[PDB]
Symmetry: C2
Subunit: 124 residues, 2 copies
């Protein structure tokens, strides 16, 4: 049972100098998208192009995945993405990430039917 | 059990959001602090001062609670806070919030032993 004090802290406390900062984007997103449960996912990329443009990659340039599987595709154009990588000081359950906004081609694995993105393989 | 397609969206898509902008603080925080589950909590305030400072409010000016309860306190000084308000175009489970930074006196209810904040009542 969550205690009242912990509830107040969860719902109302965000002690900081500039919490709304974009340097904080990854810390908040990785938390929100549930990638910090039990351990910090060490690296994760978020894509900012439309969901339609990303799905479109599944019929663009075919490439081999980093793991040898052969169902990966590389986007024809660069896309705006946010790279999230643990800081040299992040320790669960206080995961910490460095936010890096860049534009690069993305490589995703496509599967299912219709064939759609099911895994983020890499950015180049 | 989440579909592969959906997992990719959760872990890698962020196309409908001013991403790393300050305007996005509330959307990410309400999500991260779990106030958007089963229903979007319509209104919520986050305090940026230190936990000690907020706890210290429990021993400042007594004021009545909005609900008639008597364990409410008002901070002697203003505190930097953020107001998160569900926007007209928000529809669960796609909760959208408006972020507004202000510096005001806060009013919290205190409980337990030792007496610590257990409810955010308002800001004045």
């Amino acid at each position: 049972k969550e205690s009242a004090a912990a509830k107040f802290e969860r719902q109302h406390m965000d002690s900081s100098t500039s919490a709304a900062s974009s340097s904080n984007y990854c810390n908040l997103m990785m938390c929100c998208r549930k990638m910090t449960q039990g351990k910090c996912k060490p690296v994760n990329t978020f894509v900012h192009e439309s969901l339609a443009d990303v799905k479109a990659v599944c019929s663009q340039k075919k490439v081999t995945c980093k793991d040898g599987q052969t169902n990966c595709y590389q986007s024809k154009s660069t896309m705006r993405i946010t790279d999230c990588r643990e800081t040299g000081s992040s320790k669960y359950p206080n995961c910490a990430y460095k936010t890096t906004q860049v534009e690069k081609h993305i490589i995703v694995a496509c599967g299912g039917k219709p064939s759609v993105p099911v895994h983020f393989d890499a950015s180049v």
